[PDB]
């Protein structure tokens, strides 16, 4: 039960390898479409760049923009992590129906993008928004 | 203000390198172009194989200078006979002279051009 909705984890397989994600909702039982212990996650595809005392608000905002992704990932391809990230905006928005409905997939991706904007700007989960150097 | 060295190496500083401004030119008169078209094209070839290339391949065969290359032969032919070649092949003969096969365009008739030169 270390993989719960709201736990931060790392992806080790696939295109988004080495990226930090938050478990949106766990399907540990499995599904007909995914006959394994998969879990939908939202992660940061492009981490925001570092900022400084200098640079105008334009450059700071330009470097603070974040590109997210949403993906169904196997448990064996996820690496769990002790840090936990939670927000009520990202509870229950994702499901199988969202993945089949591509407009909902894009809408959920944009909602995850926005939610990461306020979270980064507010300075929460600085580790989650820091890229991992491997 | 003591200058900070961060390399532990001293590398020779860059100083102004003036360009040459001679008080006199070493040569009074510049030489003329040593390889002009009249020296590039020596003679045409009128042997039986040369005629065969003229009447079928649309190709003119010339005795040319040793220092002449494909580019200079094309410019020399263009300026000396007003016909632009499409292809040039060169070989050094066993007698030490260079021979150039000059394939003319379909716009030009190698038979006619050979006639104007006079060796046909």
């Amino acid at each position: 039960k270390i993989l719960k909705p709201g736990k931060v984890a790392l992806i080790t397989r696939g295109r988004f390898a080495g990226k930090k994600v938050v478990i949106l909702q766990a399907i540990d039982q499995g599904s007909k479409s995914h006959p394994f212990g998969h879990a939908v996650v939202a992660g940061v595809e492009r981490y925001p760049l570092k900022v400084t005392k200098s640079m105008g608000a334009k450059r700071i905002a330009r470097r603070s923009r974040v590109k997210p992704f949403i993906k169904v990932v196997n448990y064996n391809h996820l690496m769990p992590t002790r840090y936990a990230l939670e927000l009520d905006n990202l509870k229950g928005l994702i499901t199988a129906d969202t993945f089949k409905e591509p407009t909902q997939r894009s809408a959920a991706r944009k909602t995850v993008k926005k939610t990461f904007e306020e979270k980064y700007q507010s300075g929460k989960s600085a580790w989650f928004f820091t890229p991992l150097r491997f | 203000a003591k200058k900070v060295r961060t390399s532990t190496t001293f590398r020779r500083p860059k100083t102004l390198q003036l360009s040459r401004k001679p008080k006199y030119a070493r040569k009074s008169v510049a030489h003329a172009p040593r390889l002009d078209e009249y020296k590039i094209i020596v003679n045409p070839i009128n042997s039986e194989s040369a005629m065969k290339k003229i009447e079928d391949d649309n190709t003119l065969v010339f005795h040319v200078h040793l220092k002449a290359n494909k580019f200079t032969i094309k410019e020399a032919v263009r300026k000396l006979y007003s016909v632009e070649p499409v292809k040039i092949n060169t070989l050094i003969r066993p007698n030490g002279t260079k021979k150039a096969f000059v394939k003319l365009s379909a716009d030009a008739d190698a038979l006619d051009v050979a006639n104007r030169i006079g060796f046909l």
């Binding site: 603070s64 | 900070v4 190496t9 001293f10």
Partner: peptide, 30 residues
């Protein structure tokens, strides 16, 4: 006081982060 700044200090001990550019004037091969 933007929280995005953070410190990120560098430690220049033996085996730690790369040594900073120092004055080496007393070691230069003159």
């Amino acid at each position: 006081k933007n929280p995005l700044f953070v410190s990120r200090p560098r430690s220049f001990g033996i085996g730690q982060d790369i040594q900073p550019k120092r004055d080496l004037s007393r070691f230069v091969k003159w």
